[PDB]
Amino acid sequence: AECSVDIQGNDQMQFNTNAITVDRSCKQFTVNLSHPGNLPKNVMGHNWVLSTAADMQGVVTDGMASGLDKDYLKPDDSRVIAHTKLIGSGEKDSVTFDVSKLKEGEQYMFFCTFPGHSALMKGTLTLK
Ligand SMILES: [Cu+2]
């Protein structure tokens, strides 16, 4: 079982994958996020946020309203299944979450909630 993935967010508003697969035999799954490039967090910050596909737009909008000091996430947002912190160039973060939080049939998305980034910086997350 492959229970982790390394993902990069760069200076050109790209993640280097748009589809993550979570083996359902994994008890926990880990996302290791890094940021190649040289732009700082306040202008090209990236996070990795997981929600249902239906909830993404709300999470992104409310995250915008929350601001940089809150890593562009609504505090205690019930729709956020898991998330990293917001990182700038040269920085990294990891998040580990319980695979039991994912339910058969539901559609999940990952994305960055930094203002303006989610249109490109998004992808699917799917049980196997
Ligand atoms: Cu971003």
Coordinates of N, CA and C and ligand atoms in Angstrom, one line a residue:
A1 N 0.9 -1.2 0.0 CA 0.0 0.0 0.0 C 0.9 1.3 0.0
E2 N 0.5 2.2 -0.9 CA 1.2 3.5 -1.0 C 0.4 4.5 -0.3
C3 N 0.8 4.9 0.9 CA 0.0 5.7 1.8 C 0.5 7.1 1.9
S4 N 1.3 7.6 0.9 CA 1.7 9.0 0.9 C 2.0 9.5 -0.5
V5 N 2.0 10.8 -0.6 CA 2.3 11.4 -1.9 C 3.1 12.7 -1.6
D6 N 4.0 13.0 -2.5 CA 4.8 14.3 -2.4 C 4.2 15.2 -3.5
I7 N 3.9 16.4 -3.2 CA 3.3 17.3 -4.2 C 4.1 18.6 -4.1
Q8 N 4.2 19.3 -5.2 CA 4.9 20.6 -5.3 C 3.9 21.6 -5.8
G9 N 4.0 22.9 -5.3 CA 3.3 24.0 -5.8 C 4.4 25.0 -6.2
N10 N 4.4 25.6 -7.4 CA 5.5 26.4 -7.8 C 5.1 27.9 -8.0
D11 N 6.1 28.6 -8.6 CA 5.9 30.0 -8.8 C 5.0 30.4 -9.9
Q12 N 4.4 29.4 -10.6 CA 3.6 29.7 -11.8 C 2.2 29.1 -11.5
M13 N 1.8 29.0 -10.2 CA 0.4 28.6 -9.8 C 0.1 27.2 -10.3
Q14 N 1.0 26.2 -10.2 CA 0.8 24.8 -10.5 C 1.1 23.9 -9.4
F15 N 0.3 22.9 -9.2 CA 0.6 21.7 -8.5 C 1.2 20.7 -9.6
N16 N 2.0 19.8 -9.1 CA 2.6 18.8 -10.1 C 1.8 17.5 -10.2
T17 N 0.6 17.5 -9.6 CA -0.3 16.4 -9.9 C -1.7 17.0 -9.9
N18 N -2.6 16.4 -10.7 CA -4.0 16.8 -10.6 C -5.0 15.6 -10.2
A19 N -4.4 14.6 -9.7 CA -5.2 13.4 -9.3 C -4.4 12.6 -8.3
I20 N -4.9 12.4 -7.1 CA -4.3 11.6 -6.0 C -5.2 10.4 -5.8
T21 N -4.5 9.3 -5.6 CA -5.2 8.0 -5.3 C -4.8 7.6 -3.9
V22 N -5.8 7.3 -3.1 CA -5.6 6.8 -1.7 C -6.1 5.4 -1.6
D23 N -5.2 4.5 -1.5 CA -5.4 3.0 -1.2 C -6.2 2.9 0.1
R24 N -7.4 2.3 0.0 CA -8.3 2.3 1.1 C -7.8 1.3 2.2
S25 N -6.8 0.5 1.9 CA -6.2 -0.4 2.9 C -5.2 0.4 3.9
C26 N -4.9 1.7 3.5 CA -4.2 2.6 4.3 C -5.0 3.1 5.5
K27 N -4.5 3.0 6.7 CA -5.2 3.5 7.8 C -5.2 5.1 7.8
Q28 N -4.0 5.6 7.5 CA -3.8 7.0 7.3 C -3.1 7.3 6.0
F29 N -3.3 8.5 5.5 CA -2.7 9.0 4.3 C -2.0 10.3 4.6
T30 N -0.8 10.5 4.0 CA 0.1 11.6 4.2 C 0.4 12.3 2.9
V31 N 0.2 13.7 3.0 CA 0.6 14.5 1.9 C 1.8 15.4 2.3
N32 N 2.9 15.3 1.6 CA 4.0 16.1 1.8 C 4.1 17.2 0.7
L33 N 3.8 18.4 1.2 CA 3.8 19.6 0.2 C 5.1 20.4 0.3
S34 N 5.7 20.8 -0.8 CA 6.8 21.7 -0.9 C 6.6 22.8 -2.0
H35 N 7.4 23.8 -2.0 CA 7.3 24.9 -2.8 C 8.6 25.3 -3.5
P36 N 8.9 24.7 -4.6 CA 10.0 25.2 -5.5 C 9.8 26.6 -5.9
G37 N 10.9 27.3 -6.3 CA 10.7 28.7 -6.7 C 11.3 29.6 -5.7
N38 N 11.0 30.9 -5.9 CA 11.6 31.9 -5.0 C 10.6 33.0 -4.5
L39 N 9.3 32.9 -4.9 CA 8.3 33.8 -4.4 C 7.8 33.6 -3.0
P40 N 7.7 34.6 -2.2 CA 7.3 34.4 -0.8 C 5.8 34.1 -0.6
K41 N 5.5 33.6 0.6 CA 4.1 33.2 1.0 C 3.0 34.2 0.8
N42 N 3.3 35.5 1.0 CA 2.3 36.5 0.9 C 1.8 36.8 -0.5
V43 N 2.6 36.4 -1.5 CA 2.2 36.6 -2.9 C 2.0 35.4 -3.7
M44 N 2.6 34.3 -3.4 CA 2.5 33.0 -4.1 C 2.5 31.8 -3.1
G45 N 1.9 32.0 -1.9 CA 1.7 31.0 -0.9 C 0.8 29.9 -1.4
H46 N 1.1 28.6 -1.0 CA 0.3 27.5 -1.3 C 0.0 26.7 -0.1
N47 N -1.2 26.2 0.0 CA -1.6 25.1 0.9 C -2.2 23.9 0.1
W48 N -2.4 22.8 0.8 CA -3.1 21.7 0.3 C -4.3 21.4 1.2
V49 N -5.5 21.6 0.6 CA -6.7 21.5 1.4 C -7.6 20.5 0.7
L50 N -8.3 19.7 1.5 CA -9.1 18.6 1.1 C -10.5 18.8 1.6
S51 N -11.5 18.7 0.7 CA -12.9 18.7 1.0 C -13.7 17.9 0.0
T52 N -15.0 17.7 0.2 CA -15.8 17.2 -0.8 C -15.8 18.2 -2.0
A53 N -16.0 17.6 -3.2 CA -16.0 18.5 -4.4 C -17.1 19.6 -4.3
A54 N -18.3 19.2 -3.7 CA -19.4 20.2 -3.5 C -19.0 21.4 -2.6
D55 N -18.1 21.1 -1.6 CA -17.8 22.1 -0.6 C -16.6 23.0 -1.1
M56 N -15.9 22.6 -2.1 CA -14.7 23.4 -2.5 C -15.0 24.9 -2.6
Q57 N -16.0 25.2 -3.4 CA -16.2 26.7 -3.7 C -16.4 27.5 -2.4
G58 N -17.2 26.9 -1.5 CA -17.4 27.6 -0.2 C -16.1 27.7 0.7
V59 N -15.4 26.7 0.7 CA -14.1 26.7 1.5 C -13.2 27.7 0.9
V60 N -13.1 27.8 -0.4 CA -12.2 28.7 -1.1 C -12.7 30.2 -0.9
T61 N -13.9 30.5 -1.0 CA -14.5 31.8 -0.8 C -14.3 32.3 0.6
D62 N -14.7 31.4 1.6 CA -14.6 31.8 3.0 C -13.1 31.9 3.4
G63 N -12.2 31.0 2.8 CA -10.8 31.1 3.1 C -10.2 32.4 2.6
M64 N -10.7 32.9 1.4 CA -10.3 34.2 0.9 C -10.6 35.3 2.0
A65 N -11.8 35.3 2.5 CA -12.3 36.3 3.4 C -11.5 36.3 4.8
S66 N -10.9 35.1 5.1 CA -10.2 34.9 6.3 C -8.8 35.5 6.3
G67 N -8.1 35.6 5.2 CA -6.9 36.4 5.1 C -5.6 35.6 5.4
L68 N -4.5 36.2 5.1 CA -3.2 35.5 5.2 C -2.9 35.1 6.6
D69 N -3.2 35.8 7.6 CA -2.9 35.5 9.0 C -3.6 34.2 9.4
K70 N -4.7 33.8 8.7 CA -5.4 32.5 9.0 C -5.1 31.5 7.9
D71 N -4.0 31.7 7.2 CA -3.6 30.7 6.1 C -4.7 30.6 5.1
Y72 N -5.5 31.6 4.9 CA -6.7 31.6 4.0 C -7.6 30.4 4.1
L73 N -7.9 30.1 5.4 CA -8.9 29.1 5.8 C -9.8 29.7 6.9
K74 N -11.1 29.5 6.7 CA -12.0 29.8 7.8 C -11.7 29.0 9.0
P75 N -11.4 29.6 10.2 CA -11.1 28.8 11.4 C -12.1 27.7 11.7
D76 N -11.6 26.5 12.0 CA -12.5 25.4 12.4 C -13.5 25.0 11.3
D77 N -13.2 25.3 10.1 CA -14.1 25.0 9.0 C -14.5 23.5 9.0
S78 N -15.7 23.2 9.3 CA -16.2 21.8 9.3 C -16.1 21.1 8.0
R79 N -16.0 21.8 6.9 CA -15.9 21.2 5.5 C -14.5 20.7 5.2
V80 N -13.5 21.2 5.9 CA -12.1 20.9 5.6 C -11.8 19.5 6.3
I81 N -11.6 18.5 5.5 CA -11.3 17.2 6.0 C -9.9 17.1 6.5
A82 N -9.0 17.8 5.8 CA -7.5 17.9 6.2 C -6.9 19.0 5.4
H83 N -5.8 19.6 6.0 CA -5.1 20.6 5.3 C -3.7 20.8 5.9
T84 N -2.8 21.2 5.0 CA -1.5 21.7 5.4 C -1.6 23.2 5.8
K85 N -0.5 23.8 6.3 CA -0.4 25.2 6.5 C -0.1 25.8 5.1
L86 N -0.1 27.1 5.0 CA 0.2 27.9 3.9 C 1.8 28.0 3.9
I87 N 2.4 27.7 2.8 CA 3.9 27.8 2.7 C 4.3 28.7 1.5
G88 N 5.5 29.2 1.7 CA 6.2 30.0 0.7 C 7.3 29.3 0.1
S89 N 8.0 29.9 -0.8 CA 9.1 29.2 -1.5 C 10.2 28.7 -0.5
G90 N 10.7 27.6 -0.7 CA 11.7 26.9 0.1 C 11.2 26.3 1.4
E91 N 9.9 26.4 1.6 CA 9.3 25.8 2.9 C 8.6 24.5 2.5
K92 N 8.2 23.8 3.6 CA 7.5 22.5 3.4 C 6.5 22.3 4.5
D93 N 5.5 21.5 4.3 CA 4.6 21.0 5.4 C 4.1 19.7 5.0
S94 N 3.6 18.9 6.0 CA 3.0 17.6 5.8 C 1.7 17.6 6.5
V95 N 0.7 16.8 6.0 CA -0.5 16.5 6.7 C -0.8 15.0 6.6
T96 N -1.2 14.4 7.8 CA -1.6 13.0 7.8 C -3.1 13.0 8.3
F97 N -3.9 12.2 7.6 CA -5.3 12.1 8.0 C -5.8 10.7 7.9
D98 N -6.9 10.5 8.7 CA -7.5 9.2 8.7 C -8.3 8.9 7.5
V99 N -8.0 7.8 6.8 CA -8.7 7.4 5.6 C -10.2 7.1 5.8
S100 N -10.5 6.7 7.0 CA -11.9 6.5 7.4 C -12.8 7.7 7.3
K101 N -12.1 8.9 7.2 CA -12.9 10.1 7.0 C -13.5 10.2 5.5
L102 N -12.9 9.3 4.6 CA -13.4 9.3 3.3 C -14.5 8.2 3.1
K103 N -15.6 8.5 2.4 CA -16.7 7.6 2.3 C -16.9 7.2 0.9
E104 N -17.3 5.9 0.7 CA -17.5 5.3 -0.6 C -18.5 6.2 -1.4
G105 N -18.2 6.4 -2.6 CA -19.2 7.1 -3.5 C -19.0 8.6 -3.6
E106 N -18.6 9.3 -2.5 CA -18.4 10.7 -2.5 C -17.3 11.2 -3.4
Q107 N -17.4 12.4 -3.9 CA -16.3 12.9 -4.7 C -15.5 13.9 -3.9
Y108 N -14.2 13.8 -3.9 CA -13.3 14.7 -3.1 C -12.4 15.5 -4.0
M109 N -12.1 16.7 -3.6 CA -11.1 17.6 -4.3 C -10.1 18.1 -3.4
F110 N -8.8 18.3 -3.9 CA -7.8 19.0 -3.1 C -7.5 20.3 -3.9
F111 N -7.1 21.3 -3.2 CA -6.9 22.6 -3.8 C -6.1 23.5 -2.9
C112 N -5.6 24.6 -3.5 CA -4.9 25.7 -2.7 C -6.0 26.8 -2.6
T113 N -6.0 27.4 -1.3 CA -7.0 28.5 -1.1 C -6.4 29.9 -1.1
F114 N -5.1 30.0 -1.5 CA -4.5 31.3 -1.6 C -5.4 32.0 -2.7
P115 N -5.7 33.3 -2.5 CA -6.5 34.0 -3.4 C -6.1 33.9 -4.9
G116 N -7.0 33.3 -5.7 CA -6.8 33.3 -7.2 C -6.2 32.0 -7.6
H117 N -5.8 31.1 -6.7 CA -5.0 29.9 -7.1 C -5.9 28.7 -7.4
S118 N -7.1 28.6 -6.8 CA -7.8 27.4 -6.9 C -8.3 27.0 -8.3
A119 N -8.4 27.9 -9.2 CA -8.9 27.6 -10.5 C -8.0 26.6 -11.2
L120 N -6.7 26.9 -11.1 CA -5.6 26.0 -11.6 C -5.1 24.9 -10.6
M121 N -5.0 25.4 -9.4 CA -4.4 24.5 -8.3 C -5.4 23.7 -7.6
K122 N -5.9 22.7 -8.3 CA -6.9 21.8 -7.8 C -6.8 20.4 -8.5
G123 N -7.4 19.4 -7.9 CA -7.4 18.1 -8.5 C -8.3 17.2 -7.7
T124 N -8.4 15.9 -8.2 CA -9.3 14.9 -7.6 C -8.5 14.1 -6.5
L125 N -9.2 13.6 -5.5 CA -8.6 12.7 -4.6 C -9.6 11.5 -4.5
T126 N -9.2 10.3 -4.7 CA -10.0 9.2 -4.9 C -9.5 7.9 -4.2
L127 N -10.4 7.3 -3.5 CA -10.1 5.9 -2.9 C -9.8 4.9 -4.0
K128 N -9.0 3.9 -3.7 CA -8.7 2.8 -4.5 C -9.0 1.5 -3.6
Ligands
CU1 CU -1.4 28.4 -4.0

